[PDB]
Design a protein around this ligand. Structure first.
Ligand SMILES: O=c1cc(-c2ccc(O)c(O)c2)oc2cc(O)cc(O)c12
Ligand SMILES: O=c1cc(-c2ccc(O)c(O)c2)oc2cc(O)cc(O)c12
Ligand code: NA
Ligand code: NA
Lengths: 116, 116, 116, 116
């Protein structure tokens, strides 16, 4: 799998567990088509979202459901969700790790892109 | 004005100048309706997007064109844009500052919500 | 004044108020010499630390007492303090803004260096 | 080993390789005594710094030599180094991962603390 998402909680100093996320891919008509979805494990990681064959060139959006995460912990956060939108595999297959660090009124996201 | 956006450049240690952005408001059919837009000033700030009477409660999205910013500097970035999606809530303070800190493969965003 | 520090709270989405900090300048024997200090205002800002003629080139450290901040809010933090260590360089712009964004188990710091 | 450090480069979207760091521990007389040191691998991680036996209670400082990292890449950065100062093992043995995300004029650091 060439796409992994890792999420950390900056309040607890822990992986962000059970964070839902939905991945979309832009279609030829400019709409967002559902691509994959899942939730983070005890390690705060989400593996196995897709395959090298399936993960073709395109513009992808990872919607990380941060609001639901905070509310489940009894906290009212600012953002609805964190979105990460990027072109993938423009120059051939790459492996992408999307990392996100969450606080109730702030988040950071970074990408590590490697060539297998 | 109850909404201001400030953008900083983490590579150069400066305001991010001439950064374009569009703000959308979510409609009842779940589509994104254009609301306001503009470009950051020399101070990296965009003021005057809206007024108190216009900025009613609801879900807003600020789509910051970070890709065009980096490309105009001759740097290849990861993200298509940075998105900040949030609910405006009258039960909270009245002034919203959305800040974003940009790197080519990462960004961070924070909300500072205060009362005059 | 060529040096300002601004501190934000990522849990509450607000300026970090009454945050104490000390600035040190590195001496020839590599010890840290007290230089200036103060507490952030209602806007999370500390102005007036130094003057142009006093702020000569050299290595400075800003030690922000983040632990006391979180404890006064009843929150257990990870770090003893946040440190920002940098060289003041006359070949660059004249005004330094050191910003810090605080969470209990994480912080971020950025420098915005500009010319009037 | 109960202490690991991971460093990412926000400009390249890659692990930060060959980053040197020195770890210190506060002595009874309030000086910083050398504790351990090493450099990040191809994965941007530094493992094996210490042992459960050696890593006793205390106040630790991880100095991550970011300036040397950027200069080796022909970039003049703002900070001398990123410091992470924290009390460890206050409530019995824990495992600590210190993560840092680097840009030339900005960095973020976070801690993941787990109970084995
Ligand atoms: O250090 C940060 C500082 C700021 C910031 C916000 C308002 C200002 O008037 C300013 O001078 C800096 O905004 C941020 C916004 C972020 O999303 C992440 C950050 O680390 C910062
Ligand atoms: O997005 C971030 C991602 C990471 C990170 C990435 C991979 C890991 O295996 C890990 O354990 C942490 O670490 C950070 C550390 C930071 O201080 C700020 C950040 O935004 C991140
Ligand atoms: Na191509
Ligand atoms: Na104890």
């Amino acid at each position: 799998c060439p796409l992994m998402v890792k999420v950390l909680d900056a309040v607890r100093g822990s992986p962000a567990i059970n964070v839902a996320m939905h991945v979309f891919r832009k279609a030829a008509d400019d709409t967002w088509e559902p691509f994959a979805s899942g939730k983070t494990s005890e390690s705060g990681e989400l593996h196995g979202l897709t395959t090298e064959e399936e993960f073709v060139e395109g513009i992808y959006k990872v919607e990380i459901d941060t609001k639901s995460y905070w509310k489940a912990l009894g906290i009212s956060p600012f953002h609805e969700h964190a979105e990460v939108v990027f072109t993938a595999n423009d120059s051939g297959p790459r492996r992408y790790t999307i990392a996100a660090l969450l606080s109730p009124y702030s988040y950071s996201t970074t990408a590590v892109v490697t060539n297998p």
